[PDB]
PDB file of C-alpha atoms and ligand atoms in Angstrom:
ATOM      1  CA  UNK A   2     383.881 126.321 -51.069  1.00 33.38           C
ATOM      2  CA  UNK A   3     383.858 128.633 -48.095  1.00 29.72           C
ATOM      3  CA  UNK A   4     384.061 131.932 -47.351  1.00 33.14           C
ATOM      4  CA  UNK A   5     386.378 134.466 -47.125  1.00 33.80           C
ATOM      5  CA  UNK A   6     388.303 135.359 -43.590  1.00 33.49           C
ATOM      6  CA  UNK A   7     385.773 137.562 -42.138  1.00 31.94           C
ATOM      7  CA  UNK A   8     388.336 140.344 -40.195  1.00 30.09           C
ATOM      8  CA  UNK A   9     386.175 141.651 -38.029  1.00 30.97           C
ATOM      9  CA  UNK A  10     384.510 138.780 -36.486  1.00 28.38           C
ATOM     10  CA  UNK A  11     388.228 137.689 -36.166  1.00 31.88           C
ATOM     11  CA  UNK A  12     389.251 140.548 -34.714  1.00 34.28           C
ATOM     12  CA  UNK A  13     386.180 140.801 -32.285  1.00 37.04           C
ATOM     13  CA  UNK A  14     386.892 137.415 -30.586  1.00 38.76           C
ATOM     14  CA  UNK A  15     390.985 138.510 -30.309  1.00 40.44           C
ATOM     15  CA  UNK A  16     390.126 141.298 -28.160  1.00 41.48           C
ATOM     16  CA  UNK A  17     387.801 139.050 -26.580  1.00 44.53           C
ATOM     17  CA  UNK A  18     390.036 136.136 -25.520  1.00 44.80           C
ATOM     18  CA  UNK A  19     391.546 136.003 -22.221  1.00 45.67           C
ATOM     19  CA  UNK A  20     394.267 132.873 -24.168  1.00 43.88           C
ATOM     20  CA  UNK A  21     395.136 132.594 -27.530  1.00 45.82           C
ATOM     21  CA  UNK A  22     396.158 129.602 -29.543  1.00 47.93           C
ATOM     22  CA  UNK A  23     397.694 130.649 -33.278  1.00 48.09           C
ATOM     23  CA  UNK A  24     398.681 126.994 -35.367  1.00 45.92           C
ATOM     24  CA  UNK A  25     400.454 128.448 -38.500  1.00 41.39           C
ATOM     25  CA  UNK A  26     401.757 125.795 -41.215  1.00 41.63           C
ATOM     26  CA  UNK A  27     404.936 127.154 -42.943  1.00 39.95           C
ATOM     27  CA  UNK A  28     405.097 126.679 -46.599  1.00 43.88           C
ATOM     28  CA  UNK A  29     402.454 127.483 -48.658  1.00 45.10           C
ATOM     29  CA  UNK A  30     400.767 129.228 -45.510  1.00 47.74           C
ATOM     30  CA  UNK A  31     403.242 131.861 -43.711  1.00 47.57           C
ATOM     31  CA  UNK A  32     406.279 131.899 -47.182  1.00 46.73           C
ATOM     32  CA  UNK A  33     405.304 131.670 -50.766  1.00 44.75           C
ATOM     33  CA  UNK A  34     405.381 127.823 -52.889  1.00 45.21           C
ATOM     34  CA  UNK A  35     409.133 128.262 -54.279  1.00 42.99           C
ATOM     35  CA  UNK A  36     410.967 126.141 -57.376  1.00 43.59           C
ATOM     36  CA  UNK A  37     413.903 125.661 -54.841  1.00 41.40           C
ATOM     37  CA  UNK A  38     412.560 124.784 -51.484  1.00 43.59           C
ATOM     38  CA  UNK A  39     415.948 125.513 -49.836  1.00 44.80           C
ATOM     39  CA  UNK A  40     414.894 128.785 -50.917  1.00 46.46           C
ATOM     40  CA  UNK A  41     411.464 129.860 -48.907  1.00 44.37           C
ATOM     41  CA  UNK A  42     414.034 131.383 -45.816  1.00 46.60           C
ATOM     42  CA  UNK A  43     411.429 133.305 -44.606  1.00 45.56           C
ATOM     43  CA  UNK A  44     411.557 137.158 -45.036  1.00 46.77           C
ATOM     44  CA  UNK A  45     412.015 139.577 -42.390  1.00 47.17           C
ATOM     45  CA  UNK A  46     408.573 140.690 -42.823  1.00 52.48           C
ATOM     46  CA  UNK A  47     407.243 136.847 -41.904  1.00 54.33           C
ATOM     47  CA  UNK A  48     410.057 137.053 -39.052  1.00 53.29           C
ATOM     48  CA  UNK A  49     408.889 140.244 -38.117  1.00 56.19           C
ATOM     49  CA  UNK A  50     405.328 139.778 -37.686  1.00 52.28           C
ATOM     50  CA  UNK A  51     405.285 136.497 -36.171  1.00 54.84           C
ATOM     51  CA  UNK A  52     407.750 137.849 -33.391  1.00 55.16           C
ATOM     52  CA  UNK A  53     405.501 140.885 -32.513  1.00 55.01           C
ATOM     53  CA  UNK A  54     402.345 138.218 -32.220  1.00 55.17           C
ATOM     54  CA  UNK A  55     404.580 135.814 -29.978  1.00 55.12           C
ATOM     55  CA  UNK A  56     405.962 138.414 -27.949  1.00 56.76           C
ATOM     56  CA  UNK A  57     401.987 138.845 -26.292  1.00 57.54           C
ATOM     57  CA  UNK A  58     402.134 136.523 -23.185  1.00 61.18           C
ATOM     58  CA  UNK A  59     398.283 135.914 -24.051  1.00 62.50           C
ATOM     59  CA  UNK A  60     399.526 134.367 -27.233  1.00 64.77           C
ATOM     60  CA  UNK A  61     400.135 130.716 -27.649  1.00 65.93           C
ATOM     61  CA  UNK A  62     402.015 130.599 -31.201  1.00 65.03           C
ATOM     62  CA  UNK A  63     403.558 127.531 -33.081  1.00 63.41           C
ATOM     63  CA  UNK A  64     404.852 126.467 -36.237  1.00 62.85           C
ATOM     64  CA  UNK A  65     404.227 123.505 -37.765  1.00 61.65           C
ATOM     65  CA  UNK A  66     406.460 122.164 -40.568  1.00 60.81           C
ATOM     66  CA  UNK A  67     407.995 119.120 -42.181  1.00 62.70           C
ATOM     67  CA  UNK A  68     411.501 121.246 -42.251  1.00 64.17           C
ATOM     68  CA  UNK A  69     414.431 119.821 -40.314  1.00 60.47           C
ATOM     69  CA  UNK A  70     414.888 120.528 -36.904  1.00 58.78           C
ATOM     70  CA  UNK A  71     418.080 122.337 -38.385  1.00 59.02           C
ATOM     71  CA  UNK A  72     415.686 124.377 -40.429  1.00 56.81           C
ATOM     72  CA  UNK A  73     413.819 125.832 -37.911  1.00 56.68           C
ATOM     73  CA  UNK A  74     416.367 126.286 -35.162  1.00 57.44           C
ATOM     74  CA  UNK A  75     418.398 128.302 -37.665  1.00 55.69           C
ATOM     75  CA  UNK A  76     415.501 130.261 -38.999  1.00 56.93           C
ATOM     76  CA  UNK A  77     412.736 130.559 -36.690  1.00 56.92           C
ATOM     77  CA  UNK A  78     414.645 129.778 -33.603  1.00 58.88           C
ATOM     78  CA  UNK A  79     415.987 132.718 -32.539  1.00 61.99           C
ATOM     79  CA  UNK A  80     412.421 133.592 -31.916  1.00 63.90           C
ATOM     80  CA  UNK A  81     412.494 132.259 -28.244  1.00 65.58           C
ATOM     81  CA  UNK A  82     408.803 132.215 -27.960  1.00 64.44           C
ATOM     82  CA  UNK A  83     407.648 130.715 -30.844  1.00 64.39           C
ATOM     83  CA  UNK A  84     406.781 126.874 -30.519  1.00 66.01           C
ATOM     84  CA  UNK A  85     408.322 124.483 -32.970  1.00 69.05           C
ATOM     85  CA  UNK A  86     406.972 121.262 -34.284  1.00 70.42           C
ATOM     86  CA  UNK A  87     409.604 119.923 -37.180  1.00 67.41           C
ATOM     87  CA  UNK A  88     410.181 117.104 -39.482  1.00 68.37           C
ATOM     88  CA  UNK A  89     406.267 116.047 -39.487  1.00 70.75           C
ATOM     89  CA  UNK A  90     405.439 115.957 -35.701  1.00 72.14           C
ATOM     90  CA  UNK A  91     409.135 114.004 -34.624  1.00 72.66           C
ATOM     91  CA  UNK A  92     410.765 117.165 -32.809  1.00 72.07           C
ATOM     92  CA  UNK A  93     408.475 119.752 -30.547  1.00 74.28           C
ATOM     93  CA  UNK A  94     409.841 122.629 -28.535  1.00 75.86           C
ATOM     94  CA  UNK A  95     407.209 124.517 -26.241  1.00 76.07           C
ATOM     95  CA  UNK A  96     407.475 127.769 -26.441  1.00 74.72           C
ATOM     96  CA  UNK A  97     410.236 129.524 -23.843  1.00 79.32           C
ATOM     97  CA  UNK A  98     412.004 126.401 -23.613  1.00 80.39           C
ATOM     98  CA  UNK A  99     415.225 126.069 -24.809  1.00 81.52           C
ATOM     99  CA  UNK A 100     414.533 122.320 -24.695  1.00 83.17           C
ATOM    100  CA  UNK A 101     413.931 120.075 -27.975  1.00 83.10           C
ATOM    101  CA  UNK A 102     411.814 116.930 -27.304  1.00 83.79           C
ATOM    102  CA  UNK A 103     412.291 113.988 -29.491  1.00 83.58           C
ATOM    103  CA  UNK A 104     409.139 111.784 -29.860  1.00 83.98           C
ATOM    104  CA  UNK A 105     410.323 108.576 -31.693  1.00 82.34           C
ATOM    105  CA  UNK A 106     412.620 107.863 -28.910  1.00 80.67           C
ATOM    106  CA  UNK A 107     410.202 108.449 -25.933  1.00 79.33           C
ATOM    107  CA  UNK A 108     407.235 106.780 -27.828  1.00 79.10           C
ATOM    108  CA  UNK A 109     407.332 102.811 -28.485  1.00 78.91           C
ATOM    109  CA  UNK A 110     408.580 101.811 -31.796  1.00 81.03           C
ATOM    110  CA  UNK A 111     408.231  98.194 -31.282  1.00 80.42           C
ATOM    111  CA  UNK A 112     405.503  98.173 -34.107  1.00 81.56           C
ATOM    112  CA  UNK A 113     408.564  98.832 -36.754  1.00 79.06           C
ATOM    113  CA  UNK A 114     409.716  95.238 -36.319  1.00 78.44           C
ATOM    114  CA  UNK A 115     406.516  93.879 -36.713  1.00 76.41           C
ATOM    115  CA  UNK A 116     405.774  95.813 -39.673  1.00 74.05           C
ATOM    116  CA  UNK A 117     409.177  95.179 -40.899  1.00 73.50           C
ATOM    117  CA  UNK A 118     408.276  91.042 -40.940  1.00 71.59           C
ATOM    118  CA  UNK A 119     404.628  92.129 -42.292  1.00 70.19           C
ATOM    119  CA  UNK A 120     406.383  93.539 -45.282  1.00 71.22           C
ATOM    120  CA  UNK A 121     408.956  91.205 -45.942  1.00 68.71           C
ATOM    121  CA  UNK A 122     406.085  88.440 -46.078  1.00 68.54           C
ATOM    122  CA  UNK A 123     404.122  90.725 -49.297  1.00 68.15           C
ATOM    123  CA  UNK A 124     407.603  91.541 -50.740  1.00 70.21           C
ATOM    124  CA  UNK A 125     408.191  87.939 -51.321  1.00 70.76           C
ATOM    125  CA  UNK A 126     404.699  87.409 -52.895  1.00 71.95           C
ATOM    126  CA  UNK A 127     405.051  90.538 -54.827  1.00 72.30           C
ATOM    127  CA  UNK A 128     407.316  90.646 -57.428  1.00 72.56           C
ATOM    128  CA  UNK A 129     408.667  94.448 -58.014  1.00 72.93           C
ATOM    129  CA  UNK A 130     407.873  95.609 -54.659  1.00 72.52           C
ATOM    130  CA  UNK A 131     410.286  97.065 -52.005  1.00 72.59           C
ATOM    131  CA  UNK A 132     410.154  98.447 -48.611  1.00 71.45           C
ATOM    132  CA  UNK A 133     411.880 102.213 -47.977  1.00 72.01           C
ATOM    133  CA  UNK A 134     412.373 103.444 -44.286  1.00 71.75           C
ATOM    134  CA  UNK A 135     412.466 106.581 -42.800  1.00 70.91           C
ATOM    135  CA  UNK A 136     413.477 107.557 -39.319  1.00 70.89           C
ATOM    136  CA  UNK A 137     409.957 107.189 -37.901  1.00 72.11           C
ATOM    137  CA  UNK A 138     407.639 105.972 -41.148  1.00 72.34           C
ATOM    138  CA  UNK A 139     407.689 102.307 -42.759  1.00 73.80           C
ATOM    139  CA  UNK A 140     406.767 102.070 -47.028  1.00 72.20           C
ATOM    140  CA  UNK A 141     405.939  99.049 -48.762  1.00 71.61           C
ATOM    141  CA  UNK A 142     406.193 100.400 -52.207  1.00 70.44           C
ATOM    142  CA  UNK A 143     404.160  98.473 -54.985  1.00 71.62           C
ATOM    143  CA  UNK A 144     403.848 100.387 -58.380  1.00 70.14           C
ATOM    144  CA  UNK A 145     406.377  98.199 -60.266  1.00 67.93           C
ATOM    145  CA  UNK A 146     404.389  95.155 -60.202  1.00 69.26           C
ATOM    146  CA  UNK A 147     400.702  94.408 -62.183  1.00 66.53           C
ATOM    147  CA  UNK A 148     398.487  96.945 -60.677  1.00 67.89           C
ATOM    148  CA  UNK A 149     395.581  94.728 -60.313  1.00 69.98           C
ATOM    149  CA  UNK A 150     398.108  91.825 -58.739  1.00 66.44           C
ATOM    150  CA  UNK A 151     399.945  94.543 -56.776  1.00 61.20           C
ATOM    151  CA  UNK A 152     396.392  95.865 -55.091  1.00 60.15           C
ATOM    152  CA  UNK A 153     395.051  92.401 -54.583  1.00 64.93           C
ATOM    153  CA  UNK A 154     398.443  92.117 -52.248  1.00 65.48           C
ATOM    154  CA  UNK A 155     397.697  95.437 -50.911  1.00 63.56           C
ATOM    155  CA  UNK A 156     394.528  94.525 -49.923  1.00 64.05           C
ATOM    156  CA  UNK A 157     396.137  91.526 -47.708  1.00 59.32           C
ATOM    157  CA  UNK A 158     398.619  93.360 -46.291  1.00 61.14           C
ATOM    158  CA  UNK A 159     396.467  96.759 -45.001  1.00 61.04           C
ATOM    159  CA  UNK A 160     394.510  94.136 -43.521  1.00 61.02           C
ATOM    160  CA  UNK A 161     396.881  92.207 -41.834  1.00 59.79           C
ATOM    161  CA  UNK A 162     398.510  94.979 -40.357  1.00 57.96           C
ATOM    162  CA  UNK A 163     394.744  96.415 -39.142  1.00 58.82           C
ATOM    163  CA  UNK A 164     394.015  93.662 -37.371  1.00 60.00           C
ATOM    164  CA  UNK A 165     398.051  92.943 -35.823  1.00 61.05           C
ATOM    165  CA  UNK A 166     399.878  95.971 -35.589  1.00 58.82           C
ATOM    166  CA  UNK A 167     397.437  98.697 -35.683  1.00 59.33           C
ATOM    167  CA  UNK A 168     395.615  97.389 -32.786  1.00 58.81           C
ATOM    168  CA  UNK A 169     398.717  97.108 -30.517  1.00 60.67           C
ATOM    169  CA  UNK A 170     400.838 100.197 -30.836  1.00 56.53           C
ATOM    170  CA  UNK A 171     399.268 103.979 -31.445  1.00 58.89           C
ATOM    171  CA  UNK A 172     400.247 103.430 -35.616  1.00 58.92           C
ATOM    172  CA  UNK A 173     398.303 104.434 -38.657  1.00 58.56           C
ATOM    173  CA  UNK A 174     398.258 102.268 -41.610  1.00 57.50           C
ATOM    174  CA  UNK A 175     397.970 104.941 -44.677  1.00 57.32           C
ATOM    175  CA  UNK A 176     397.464 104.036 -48.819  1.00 56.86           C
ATOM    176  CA  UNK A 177     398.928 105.829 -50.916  1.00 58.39           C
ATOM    177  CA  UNK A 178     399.038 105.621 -54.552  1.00 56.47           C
ATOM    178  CA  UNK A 179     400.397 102.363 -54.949  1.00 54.56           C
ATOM    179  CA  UNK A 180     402.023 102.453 -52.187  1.00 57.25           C
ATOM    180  CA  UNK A 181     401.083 101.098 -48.182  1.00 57.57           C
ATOM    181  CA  UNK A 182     402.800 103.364 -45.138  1.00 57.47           C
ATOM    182  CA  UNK A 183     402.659 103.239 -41.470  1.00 56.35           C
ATOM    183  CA  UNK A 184     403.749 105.658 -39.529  1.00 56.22           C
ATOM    184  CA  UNK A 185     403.148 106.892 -35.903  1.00 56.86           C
ATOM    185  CA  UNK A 186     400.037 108.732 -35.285  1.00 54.90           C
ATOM    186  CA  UNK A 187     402.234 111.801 -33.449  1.00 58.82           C
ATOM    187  CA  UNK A 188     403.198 112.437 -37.409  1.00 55.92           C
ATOM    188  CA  UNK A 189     399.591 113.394 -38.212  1.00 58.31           C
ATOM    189  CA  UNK A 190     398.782 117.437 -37.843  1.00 60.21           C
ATOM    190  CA  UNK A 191     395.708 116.776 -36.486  1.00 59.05           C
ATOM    191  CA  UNK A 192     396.900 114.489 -33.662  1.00 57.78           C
ATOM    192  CA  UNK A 193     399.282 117.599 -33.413  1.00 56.55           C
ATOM    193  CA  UNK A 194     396.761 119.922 -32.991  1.00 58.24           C
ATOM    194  CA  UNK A 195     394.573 118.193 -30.725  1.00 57.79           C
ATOM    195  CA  UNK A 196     397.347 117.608 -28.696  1.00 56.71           C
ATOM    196  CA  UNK A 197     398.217 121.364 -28.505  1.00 56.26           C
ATOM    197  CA  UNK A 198     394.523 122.039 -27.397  1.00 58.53           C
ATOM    198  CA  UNK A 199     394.701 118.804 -24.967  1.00 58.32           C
ATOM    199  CA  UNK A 200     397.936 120.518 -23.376  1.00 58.81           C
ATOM    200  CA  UNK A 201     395.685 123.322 -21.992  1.00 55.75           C
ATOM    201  CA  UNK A 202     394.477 120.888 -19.754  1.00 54.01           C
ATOM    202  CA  UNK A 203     390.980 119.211 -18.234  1.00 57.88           C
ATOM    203  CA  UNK A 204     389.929 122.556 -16.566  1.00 58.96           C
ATOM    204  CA  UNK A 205     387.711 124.099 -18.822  1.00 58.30           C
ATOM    205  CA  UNK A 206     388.336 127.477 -18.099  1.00 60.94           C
ATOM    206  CA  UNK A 207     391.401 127.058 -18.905  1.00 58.41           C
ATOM    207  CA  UNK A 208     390.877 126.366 -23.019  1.00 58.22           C
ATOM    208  CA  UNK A 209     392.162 129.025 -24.675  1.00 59.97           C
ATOM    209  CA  UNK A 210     389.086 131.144 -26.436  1.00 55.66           C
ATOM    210  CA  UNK A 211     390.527 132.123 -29.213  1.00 54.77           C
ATOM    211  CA  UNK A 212     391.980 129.700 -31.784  1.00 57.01           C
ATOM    212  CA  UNK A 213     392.961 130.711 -35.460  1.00 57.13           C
ATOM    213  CA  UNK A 214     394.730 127.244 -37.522  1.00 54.23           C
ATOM    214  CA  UNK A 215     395.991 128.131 -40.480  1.00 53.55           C
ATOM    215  CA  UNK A 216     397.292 125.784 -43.990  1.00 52.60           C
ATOM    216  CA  UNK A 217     397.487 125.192 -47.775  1.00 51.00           C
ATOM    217  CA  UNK A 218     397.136 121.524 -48.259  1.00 49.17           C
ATOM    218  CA  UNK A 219     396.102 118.205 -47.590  1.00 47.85           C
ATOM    219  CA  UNK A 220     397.941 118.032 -44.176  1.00 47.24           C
ATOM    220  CA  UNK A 221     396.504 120.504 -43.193  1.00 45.02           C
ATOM    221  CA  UNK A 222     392.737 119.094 -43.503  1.00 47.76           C
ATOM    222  CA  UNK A 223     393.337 117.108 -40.595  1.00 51.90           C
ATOM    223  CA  UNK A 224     394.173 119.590 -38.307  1.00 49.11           C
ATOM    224  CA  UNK A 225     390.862 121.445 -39.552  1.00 45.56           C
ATOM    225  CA  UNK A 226     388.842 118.158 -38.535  1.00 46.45           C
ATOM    226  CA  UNK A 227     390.462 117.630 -35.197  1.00 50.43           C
ATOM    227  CA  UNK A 228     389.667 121.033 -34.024  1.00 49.39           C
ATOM    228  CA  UNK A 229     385.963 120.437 -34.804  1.00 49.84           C
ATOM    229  CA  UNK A 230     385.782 117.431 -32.463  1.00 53.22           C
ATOM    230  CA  UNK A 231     388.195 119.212 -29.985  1.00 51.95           C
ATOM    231  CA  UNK A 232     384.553 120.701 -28.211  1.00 51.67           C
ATOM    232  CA  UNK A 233     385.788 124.344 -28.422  1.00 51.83           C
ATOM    233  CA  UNK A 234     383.124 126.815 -28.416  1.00 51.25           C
ATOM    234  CA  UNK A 235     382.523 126.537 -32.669  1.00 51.00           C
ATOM    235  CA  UNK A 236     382.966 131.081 -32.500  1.00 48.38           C
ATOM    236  CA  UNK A 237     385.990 130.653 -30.858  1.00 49.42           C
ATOM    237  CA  UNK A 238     387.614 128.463 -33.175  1.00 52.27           C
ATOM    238  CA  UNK A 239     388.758 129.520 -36.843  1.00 50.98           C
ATOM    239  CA  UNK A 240     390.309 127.372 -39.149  1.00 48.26           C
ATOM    240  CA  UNK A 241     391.100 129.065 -42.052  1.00 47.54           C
ATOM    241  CA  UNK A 242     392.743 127.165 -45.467  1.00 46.44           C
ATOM    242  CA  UNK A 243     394.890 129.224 -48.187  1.00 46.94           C
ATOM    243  CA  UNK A 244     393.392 128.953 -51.472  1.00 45.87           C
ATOM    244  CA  UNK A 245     390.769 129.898 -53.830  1.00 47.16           C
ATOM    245  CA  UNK A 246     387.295 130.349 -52.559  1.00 43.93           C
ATOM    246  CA  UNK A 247     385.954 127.079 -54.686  1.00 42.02           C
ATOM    247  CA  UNK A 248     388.959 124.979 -52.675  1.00 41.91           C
ATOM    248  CA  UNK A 249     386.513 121.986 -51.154  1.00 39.34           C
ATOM    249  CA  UNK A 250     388.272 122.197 -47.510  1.00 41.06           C
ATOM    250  CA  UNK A 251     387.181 121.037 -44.077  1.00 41.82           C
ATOM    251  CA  UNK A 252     388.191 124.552 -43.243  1.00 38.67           C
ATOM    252  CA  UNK A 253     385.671 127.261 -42.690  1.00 38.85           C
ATOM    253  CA  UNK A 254     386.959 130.076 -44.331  1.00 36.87           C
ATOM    254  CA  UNK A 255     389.888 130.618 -46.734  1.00 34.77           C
ATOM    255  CA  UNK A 256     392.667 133.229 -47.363  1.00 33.92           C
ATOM    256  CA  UNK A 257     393.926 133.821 -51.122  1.00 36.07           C
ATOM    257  CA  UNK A 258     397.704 133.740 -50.468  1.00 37.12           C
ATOM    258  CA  UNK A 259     400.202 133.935 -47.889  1.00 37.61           C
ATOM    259  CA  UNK A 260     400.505 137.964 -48.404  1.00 37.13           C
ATOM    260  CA  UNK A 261     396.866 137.889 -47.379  1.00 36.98           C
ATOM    261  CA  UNK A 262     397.930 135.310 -44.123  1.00 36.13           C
ATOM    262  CA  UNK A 263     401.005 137.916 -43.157  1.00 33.29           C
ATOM    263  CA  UNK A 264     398.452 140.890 -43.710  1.00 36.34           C
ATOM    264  CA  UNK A 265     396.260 139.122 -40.920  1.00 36.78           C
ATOM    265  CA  UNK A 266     398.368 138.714 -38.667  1.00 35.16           C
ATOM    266  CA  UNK A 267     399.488 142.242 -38.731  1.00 34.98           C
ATOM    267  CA  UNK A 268     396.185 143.632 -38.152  1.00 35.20           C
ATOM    268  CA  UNK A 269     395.645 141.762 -34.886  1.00 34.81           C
ATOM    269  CA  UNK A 270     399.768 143.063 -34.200  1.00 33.69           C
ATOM    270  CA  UNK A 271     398.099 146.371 -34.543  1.00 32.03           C
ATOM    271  CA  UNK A 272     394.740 145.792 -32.339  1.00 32.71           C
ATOM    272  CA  UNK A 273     396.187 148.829 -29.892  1.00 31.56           C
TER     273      UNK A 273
HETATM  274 MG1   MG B   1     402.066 123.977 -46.468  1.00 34.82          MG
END
């Protein structure tokens, strides 16, 4: 459980900051949990208010989504000074740059073909198993053979590619239900986020003093966890999950709903 936003200590350490750092997470956080995801466009309202908070040269602010880079160029965009981090972590644009980076293809993705062989080697033990790719992440999917069989494989393989892979190339090696992933570690928010607060650079008086990291879910946890090791004064940081007050989150307050995020954001718009 945690406690709810408090505004005015919020608001206290806004006026305060000299930099500001604002880590928003779209769905869930910023738009409303839709039936038809291809729905959430986000209102002008969201627009709106996330413009006016960008448009301060003291403000650092970025989106973070798993959206196509379509998605948010379309969308979000046309918001020149917003910073964009789409599909997961695989496509950042600072903000004011017109400039789209790609990371898979300036990182080293020699790890895929050794994971690829890994794979191959359990798939051929493993009778109902299969391997899906993505553009960046690697699945050995399990669930279709004995579940005590398939985890007694599962067990081999995590370890193999621990010990191989994981200590070679800058991968993480992820269970999921019955299911074994690796996958970059630029695709984790919390390698994200640190890397946002890393970009400030080694002068110290240069971190910005002000730093409010907001999300819904799961994904989100590990940006709340990297910030705590990131060695930023603890009142200048707040990371802040949506959700009920009983939600057990690494975060240290919460926020009901994402009318409750937008209404935030417009009181520090309206700080004057
Ligand atoms: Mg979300």
């Amino acid at each position: 459980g945690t406690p709810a936003l408090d505004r005015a200590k919020l608001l206290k350490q806004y006026r305060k900051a000299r930099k500001r750092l604002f880590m928003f997470d779209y769905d869930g956080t910023l738009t409303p949990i839709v039936k038809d995801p291809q729905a959430a466009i986000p209102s002008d309202r969201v627009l709106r208010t996330l413009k006016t908070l960008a448009a301060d040269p003291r403000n650092a602010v970025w989106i973070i989504s798993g959206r196509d880079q379509a998605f948010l160029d379309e969308w979000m965009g046309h918001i020149p000074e917003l910073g964009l981090s789409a599909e997961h972590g695989c496509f950042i644009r600072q903000p004011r740059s017109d400039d789209w980076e790609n990371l898979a293809e300036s990182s080293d993705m020699g790890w895929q073909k050794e994971v690829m062989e890994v794979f191959q080697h359990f798939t051929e033990r493993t009778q109902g198993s299969f391997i899906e790719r993505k553009r960046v992440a690697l699945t050995w999917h399990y669930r279709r053979a004995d579940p005590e069989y398939g985890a007694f494989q599962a067990r081999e393989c995590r370890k193999m590619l621990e010990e191989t892979v994981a200590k070679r190339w800058e991968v993480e090696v992820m269970a999921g239900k019955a299911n074994l992933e690796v996958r970059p570690t630029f695709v984790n928010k919390g390698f994200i986020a640190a890397r946002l607060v890393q970009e400030y650079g080694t002068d110290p008086a240069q971190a910005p003093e002000f730093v409010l990291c907001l999300g819904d879910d799961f994904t989100d946890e590990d940006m709340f966890r990297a910030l705590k090791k990131s060695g930023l004064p603890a009142g200048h940081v707040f990371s802040v999950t949506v959700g009920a007050s009983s939600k057990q989150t690494e975060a240290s307050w919460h926020l009901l709903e994402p009318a409750d995020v937008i209404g935030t954001i417009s009181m520090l718009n309206n700080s004057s």
